């Protein structure tokens with residue numbers, strides 16, 4: 001059952017189309033969030049993608065034809081496409097777009113100086129006590145579109161309706177905090193049907209504009225999850241997560257889009273150092289295993305590239321698929337969605353989606369937790385410096401199960417590629433997990 005989606009940051013349409021057929025489809029990913037496909041400014045920095053010139057599908061990821069080929073090829077594989085949409089602004093200053101268009105002085109090929117809000121600057125303090133300035137002034141200098149204008153709302157909605165016709169099935173509304181929820185509701189009245197849409201709102205609390213103001217127009221990104229999960233795994237006790245979710249002040253599970261990190265907060269935008277990324281290796285594995293196993297939110301697995309510190313640097317200068325050679329796990333693309341632990345976690349979630357309850361919770365009161373998803377699956381994480389050799393109780397049928405985190409079940413279901421977990425006649429399991437490791441089993445990965 002589809003339950004997870006991945007974000008292939010800066011991946012071009014070619015790589016995404018291939019990745020769909022070769023891995024994403026077969027593994028179980030529901031869909032893919034792609035980088036803005038519309039025309040943007042020229043430059044190698046990743047953030048150039050967030051400075052639109054027009055809405056013609058000519059970006060750094062490829063052209064219209066290529067984009068279309070990508071949507072189609074993924075659909076056949078069983079993978080939807082989510083398009084990161086810019087609804088709050090347009091490029092800044094003056095220049096040229098990736099499709100050859102010119103712009104300058106709030107004058108684009110499809111917008112005039114009158115289609116924008118009068119120029120003013122958004123200040124750090126404005127977020128706390130001035131929703132007006134937050135949604136009407138310029139964010140980092142980006143021309144702020146007049147989202148209340150019928151003309152503006154029509155051109156954006158036309159862009160969205162085109163991508164739907166092409167087959168896009170979801171949308172990410174970027175910088176939704178900088179756009180009045182009222183304007184978003186108007187926009188959606190012009191959008192055909194009801195495509196999956198989630199809004200990027202960064203609300204850690206104490207802000208003029210609350211995340212809750214958008215629960216009505218679609219899902220919302222819950223940044224608390226990220227910083228809290230990271231902070232717990234780094235400086236707290238995993239035993240605290242027993243009631244993670246609404247109990248910690250988080251928005252409703254069925255409204256939240258959670259994740260361990262994203263392209264922003266992994267660069268210091270929306271999260272401090274406590275956030276966990278691919279650079280933390282095994283820590284990232286464990287953290288991801290928790291997220292995918294825990295029945296809260298719609299998980300967004302991250303797929304990034306090593307930027308060697310430079311937070312402005314763009315993606316690698318080599319495709320993920322280099323003449324039959326996969327450029328992953330090294331100094332270019334990290335392809336975390338392919339890491340055994342993370343993919344294994346995706347598998348767990350997919351086969352336990354028929355029991356969104358956390359059962360038989362157990363913990364050593366500190367950094368060894370364990371719980372199940374009813375008789376559909378069970379997991380355990382050991383973050384201590386000694387082996388977890390405790391006997392836990394499960395609701396799973398006795399037998400031999402594959403630890404889907406370290407391997408998978410064979411075709412004939414008569415073997416596992418990784419280690420085998422045993423559930424005794426009484427439904428218990430005599431754990432045997434080394435320091436900083438984990439296990440996870442489900443009903444669709446049973447032997448013989």
Ligand SMILES: [Ca+2]
Nearest residue numbers: 135136144178
């Ligand atoms: Ca705005």
